[PDB]
Amino acid sequence: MAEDWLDCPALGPGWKRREVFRKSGATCGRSDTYYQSPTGDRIRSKVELTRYLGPACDLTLFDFKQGILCYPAPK
DNA sequence: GTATCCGGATAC
DNA sequence: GTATCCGGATAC
């Protein structure tokens, strides 16, 4: 178990992101990144992330393939 | 029972 | 047509 859990500053402390290069079947070869909340919540995408954070807390600067906030805020 | 992963579904 | 997110299923 434990494929590769890496930190995820795209949200805050506690968050963890992982990479999944498929395993087989038909979709084999695709890479899916899964990340768990910072203290209790399984999110598999940005929407799921926007859920535990609230609908008003959008995440357009969050990378679904990396799990990081490339840019914090403009002004 | 847990855990991972596979596959597709939907959307306008 | 593409893109993204979700869900369940299986596994032993």
**Domain that residue A30 falls in:** 1-75
A18 touches strand C (CB under 7 A): no
β-strands A5-7, A16-20 pairing: antiparallel
Q: Are the CB atoms for A37 and A15 separated by under 8 Å?
A: yes
Nucleotides of C under 7 A from a protein CB: 4-7
Give the Cα separation of A72 and A39 in Å (integer): 22
Q: How was this structure determined?
A: NMR
* A20 CA → B5 C1’, Å: 8
Give the Cα separation of A43 and A75 in Å (integer): 29
What residues contact A31, with CB distance under 8 A and at least 6 apart?
A19, A20, A21, A22, A65
Residue type, A48: E
Q: How many structural domains comprise chain A?
A: 1
What residues contact A20, with CB distance under 8 A and at least 6 apart?
A3, A31, A32, A33, A34
Any idea what the CATH number is for the domain that residue A8 is in? 3.30.890.10
